[PDB]
Design a protein around this ligand. Structure first.
Ligand SMILES: Cc1occc1C(=O)N[C@H](Cc1nc2ccccc2[nH]1)C(=O)O
Length: 145
């Protein structure tokens, strides 16, 4: 399997699924390194973020747990097709890149926080991470190139 990917057993169904310990992605289907990738993301900050403040909210007070729960609700909507990533990023990302539908542009290794970068570079083009934790907060990352 590619970098990060492990086979696991589901504990509701007993069906095999796959999970990625670098991106926190998980999926039923079996999954199919570049110099630069291009990603967008949605950031939900919490009271222990390095900078507990954003364009949406001057003093961010939510707990880490509550941020994770928001992140999980967004992943659910994006995966059900109920909302698209860009539309949730624009409305709800605590990063100022919300204004560009979460787009960060292209970047190479050596530029981002390591857990963000690792996840970015382990995604395939088109793929979305699960919850990725950095000192900024909790992200959903979409690799777009
Ligand atoms: C100022 C700016 O323009 C684009 C992104 C950013 C930025 O670093 N924003 C940060 C939030 C943040 N932290 C990140 C960590 C990794 C990747 C993107 C990230 N964005 C902030 O507002 O505190």
């Amino acid at each position: 399997l590619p970098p990060g990917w492990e086979k696991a057993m589901s504990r509701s169904s007993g069906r095999v699924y796959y999970f990625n310990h670098i991106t926190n992605a998980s999926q039923w289907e079996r999954p199919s390194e570049p110099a630069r990738v291009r990603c967008s993301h949605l950031l939900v900050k919490h009271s222990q973020s390095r900078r507990p403040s954003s364009w949406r909210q001057e003093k961010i007070t939510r707990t880490k747990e509550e941020a994770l729960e928001l992140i999980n609700g967004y992943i659910q909507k994006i995966k059900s097709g109920e909302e698209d990533f860009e539309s949730l990023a624009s409305q709800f990302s605590d990063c100022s890149s919300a204004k560009a539908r979460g787009d960060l542009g292209a970047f190479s290794r050596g530029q981002m926080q390591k857990p963000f970068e690792d996840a970015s570079f382990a995604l395939r083009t088109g793929e979305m991470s699960g919850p990725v934790f950095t000192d900024s907060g909790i992200h959903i990352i979409l690799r777009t190139e």
